[PDB]
Design a protein around this motif. Structure first.
Motif, mmCIF file in Angstrom:
data_model
loop_
_atom_site.group_PDB
_atom_site.id
_atom_site.type_symbol
_atom_site.label_atom_id
_atom_site.label_comp_id
_atom_site.label_asym_id
_atom_site.label_seq_id
_atom_site.Cartn_x
_atom_site.Cartn_y
_atom_site.Cartn_z
ATOM 1 N N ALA B 243 -40.897 53.615 -11.701
ATOM 2 C CA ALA B 243 -40.371 54.963 -11.906
ATOM 3 C C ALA B 243 -39.055 55.160 -11.164
ATOM 4 C CB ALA B 243 -41.403 56.004 -11.472
ATOM 5 N N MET B 244 -38.957 54.672 -9.925
ATOM 6 C CA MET B 244 -37.691 54.764 -9.203
ATOM 7 C C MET B 244 -36.578 54.024 -9.940
ATOM 8 S SD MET B 244 -38.477 56.671 -6.658
ATOM 9 C CE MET B 244 -39.898 57.320 -7.544
ATOM 10 N N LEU B 245 -36.857 52.806 -10.411
ATOM 11 C CA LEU B 245 -35.830 52.065 -11.136
ATOM 12 C C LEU B 245 -35.423 52.795 -12.412
ATOM 13 C CD1 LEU B 245 -37.251 48.508 -10.707
ATOM 14 C CD2 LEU B 245 -35.033 49.197 -9.906
ATOM 15 N N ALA B 246 -36.390 53.415 -13.082
ATOM 16 C CA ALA B 246 -36.099 54.055 -14.357
ATOM 17 C C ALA B 246 -35.209 55.275 -14.174
ATOM 18 C CB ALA B 246 -37.392 54.454 -15.070
ATOM 19 N N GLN B 247 -35.478 56.086 -13.164
ATOM 20 C CA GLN B 247 -34.909 57.424 -13.123
ATOM 21 C C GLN B 247 -34.007 57.719 -11.920
ATOM 22 O OE1 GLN B 247 -35.399 60.802 -15.506
ATOM 23 N NE2 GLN B 247 -33.549 59.856 -14.636
ATOM 24 N N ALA B 248 -34.125 56.995 -10.800
ATOM 25 C CA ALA B 248 -33.455 57.417 -9.563
ATOM 26 C C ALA B 248 -32.008 56.918 -9.520
ATOM 27 C CB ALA B 248 -34.247 56.948 -8.350
ATOM 28 N N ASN B 249 -31.218 57.405 -10.479
ATOM 29 C CA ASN B 249 -29.889 56.874 -10.755
ATOM 30 C C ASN B 249 -28.834 57.975 -10.833
ATOM 31 O OD1 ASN B 249 -31.050 54.171 -11.146
ATOM 32 N ND2 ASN B 249 -31.861 55.023 -13.058
ATOM 33 N N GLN B 250 -29.039 59.106 -10.165
ATOM 34 C CA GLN B 250 -28.026 60.152 -10.254
ATOM 35 C C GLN B 250 -26.954 59.985 -9.188
ATOM 36 O OE1 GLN B 250 -31.391 61.542 -10.017
ATOM 37 N NE2 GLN B 250 -31.464 60.932 -12.163
ATOM 38 N N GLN B 251 -25.828 60.641 -9.431
ATOM 39 C CA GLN B 251 -24.768 60.761 -8.442
ATOM 40 C C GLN B 251 -24.858 62.101 -7.725
ATOM 41 O OE1 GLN B 251 -22.098 59.255 -12.100
ATOM 42 N NE2 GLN B 251 -20.929 60.027 -10.342
ATOM 43 N N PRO B 252 -24.708 62.083 -6.397
ATOM 44 C CA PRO B 252 -24.843 63.327 -5.623
ATOM 45 C C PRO B 252 -23.961 64.459 -6.115
ATOM 46 C CG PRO B 252 -24.772 61.451 -4.167
ATOM 47 C CD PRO B 252 -24.486 60.911 -5.534
ATOM 48 N N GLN B 253 -22.732 64.155 -6.541
ATOM 49 C CA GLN B 253 -21.820 65.219 -6.948
ATOM 50 C C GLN B 253 -22.281 65.879 -8.244
ATOM 51 O OE1 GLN B 253 -20.011 65.262 -4.217
ATOM 52 N NE2 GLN B 253 -19.471 67.347 -4.857
ATOM 53 N N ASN B 254 -22.848 65.093 -9.162
ATOM 54 C CA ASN B 254 -23.442 65.675 -10.366
ATOM 55 C C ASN B 254 -24.635 66.552 -10.023
ATOM 56 O OD1 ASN B 254 -21.533 64.148 -11.630
ATOM 57 N ND2 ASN B 254 -22.964 62.922 -12.847
ATOM 58 N N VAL B 255 -25.476 66.116 -9.083
ATOM 59 C CA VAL B 255 -26.629 66.921 -8.708
ATOM 60 C C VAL B 255 -26.196 68.249 -8.099
ATOM 61 C CG1 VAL B 255 -28.685 67.006 -7.289
ATOM 62 C CG2 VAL B 255 -28.068 64.889 -8.448
ATOM 63 N N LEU B 256 -25.187 68.215 -7.220
ATOM 64 C CA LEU B 256 -24.706 69.452 -6.626
ATOM 65 C C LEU B 256 -24.233 70.429 -7.702
ATOM 66 C CD1 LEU B 256 -24.420 70.492 -3.669
ATOM 67 C CD2 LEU B 256 -22.011 69.852 -3.821
ATOM 68 N N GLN B 257 -23.443 69.935 -8.662
ATOM 69 C CA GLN B 257 -22.932 70.777 -9.737
ATOM 70 C C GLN B 257 -24.073 71.391 -10.542
ATOM 71 O OE1 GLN B 257 -21.385 72.861 -12.418
ATOM 72 N NE2 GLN B 257 -19.907 71.893 -11.019
ATOM 73 N N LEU B 258 -25.100 70.590 -10.830
ATOM 74 C CA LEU B 258 -26.204 71.060 -11.663
ATOM 75 C C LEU B 258 -27.112 72.051 -10.957
ATOM 76 C CD1 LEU B 258 -27.084 67.642 -13.143
ATOM 77 C CD2 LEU B 258 -26.419 69.645 -14.518
ATOM 78 N N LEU B 259 -27.135 72.050 -9.629
ATOM 79 C CA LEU B 259 -28.004 72.965 -8.926
ATOM 80 C C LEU B 259 -27.312 74.270 -8.562
ATOM 81 C CD1 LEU B 259 -29.988 70.483 -6.652
ATOM 82 C CD2 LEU B 259 -30.730 71.589 -8.738
ATOM 83 N N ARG B 260 -26.018 74.402 -8.827
ATOM 84 C CA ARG B 260 -25.316 75.665 -8.537
ATOM 85 C C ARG B 260 -25.943 76.857 -9.255
ATOM 86 N NH1 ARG B 260 -19.131 75.178 -9.753
ATOM 87 N NH2 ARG B 260 -19.198 77.264 -8.794
#
Lengths: 112, 260
Positions: B243-260
């Motif tokens: 599961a980690m290999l499948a999904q744990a592939n985001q970039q921090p800056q994209n995550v910050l933008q998406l959580l605004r």
């Protein structure tokens, strides 16, 4: 402030942040429907959709588990768009359930 | 390879922005539709009160008919309130700002939705004035004459005038209300047609992105999605490293933008 948290998060924690964020936006949208606030409903459903799309687009398709995760994300995306079009809080509760499933399971998975 | 990935990313992002635009537009249309449903309900209540006031043989003008008129005036104030307060991101939707302007077309303001990523891919929407002075018996040129709008209703006039009295008799004042109801219904139906076009646009955009990205779109109903969700949850649990290999592939800056 929150900038530090994304930058200090492990990859597993980053994904967990996204699941929890998706849940927050779905719940905000359901309350906005109850408030008859179409504008706030839409803003939050677009944000929830964008998180589902990011999760889908960052799946490693070389990993077998990705196929079933991607099929669920595609359904969840379509269901959130339909919930926006139909102002249907039952569809939101449905998708909230699936995201909670992923979130709860992911939180156990990243334990070690 | 770079040219293919760049073309694909540009296509996807174009579809995503067109879909955001169209969903924003449908949420503006829904805002107008919900407000006009309330106006329609108020007009139906006004209609009941006009029917009540028509029983002048049993109603006293200075008490009963004035009391009914006071309630009608409060209801038409509410119609005016809806027409003035209904907004989407600050745009007054129902006060005539966006009406069709026959007499001076350069003055016309339109609600424009950019529903595709390319030139000419717009829908232009107008909404008429839904205030009480703009609803009622219309002249050939679309204006409303004295005594012919919902704002002009006065059921105390029934006490001293037969029902067939021009302009102010029961029949004429009821006609004002019925024309207003038809005008609000017509405006609601026109907005519903726009909503239907936007729905089709959004569903086509979703389908286009799915085909472009080779999405697995076979889950098409609630019970199947519930079953597949339980399956996926269990596999996240039982194959955590996968599961980690499948999904744990985001970039921090994209995550910050998406959580605004």
């Amino acid at each position: 402030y929150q900038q530090n948290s994304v930058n200090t998060a492990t990859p597993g924690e980053l994904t967990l942040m996204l699941y929890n964020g998706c849940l927050k936006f779905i719940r905000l949208a359901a309350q906005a429907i109850e408030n008859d606030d179409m504008e706030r409903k839409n803003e939050n459903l677009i944000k929830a959709q964008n998180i589902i799309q990011e999760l889908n687009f960052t799946l490693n398709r070389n990993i077998e588990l990705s196929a079933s995760m991607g099929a669920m994300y595609d359904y969840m995306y379509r269901r959130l768009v339909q919930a926006n079009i139909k102002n249907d809080t039952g569809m939101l509760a449905e998708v909230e359930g699936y995201v909670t499933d992923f979130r709860d399971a992911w939180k156990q998975a990243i334990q070690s | 390879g770079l040219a293919i990935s760049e073309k694909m990313r540009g296509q996807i992002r174009g579809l995503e922005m067109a879909s955001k635009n169209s969903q924003d537009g449908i949420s503006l249309i829904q805002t107008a539709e919900g407000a006009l449903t309330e106006t329609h309900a108020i007009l139906q209540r006004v209609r009941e009160l006009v029917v009540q006031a028509g029983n002048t043989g049993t109603q006293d003008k200075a008490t009963d008919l004035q009391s009914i008129q006071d309630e009608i005036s409060a209801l038409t104030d509410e119609i005016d309130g809806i027409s003035n307060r209904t907004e989407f991101n600050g745009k007054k939707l129902l006060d005539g700002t966006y009406k069709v302007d026959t007499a001076t077309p350069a003055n016309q303001k339109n609600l424009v939705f950019q529903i595709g990523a390319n030139a000419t891919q717009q829908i232009s929407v107008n909404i008429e004035d839904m205030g009480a002075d703009a609803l009622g018996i219309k002249e050939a040129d679309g204006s409303i004459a004295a005594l012919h709008s919902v704002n002009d209703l006065d059921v105390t006039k029934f006490a001293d005038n037969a029902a067939d009295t021009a302009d102010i008799g029961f029949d004429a004042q009821l006609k004002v209300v019925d024309e207003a109801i038809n005008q609000v219904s017509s405006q609601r139906a026109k907005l519903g047609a726009v909503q239907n076009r936007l729905e089709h646009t959004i569903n086509n955009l979703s389908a286009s992105g799915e085909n472009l990205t080779a999405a697995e779109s076979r889950i098409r109903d609630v019970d199947m999605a519930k079953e597949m969700s339980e399956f996926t949850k269990n596999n996240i649990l039982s194959q955590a490293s996968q599961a980690m290999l499948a999904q744990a592939n985001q970039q921090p800056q994209n995550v910050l933008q998406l959580l605004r």
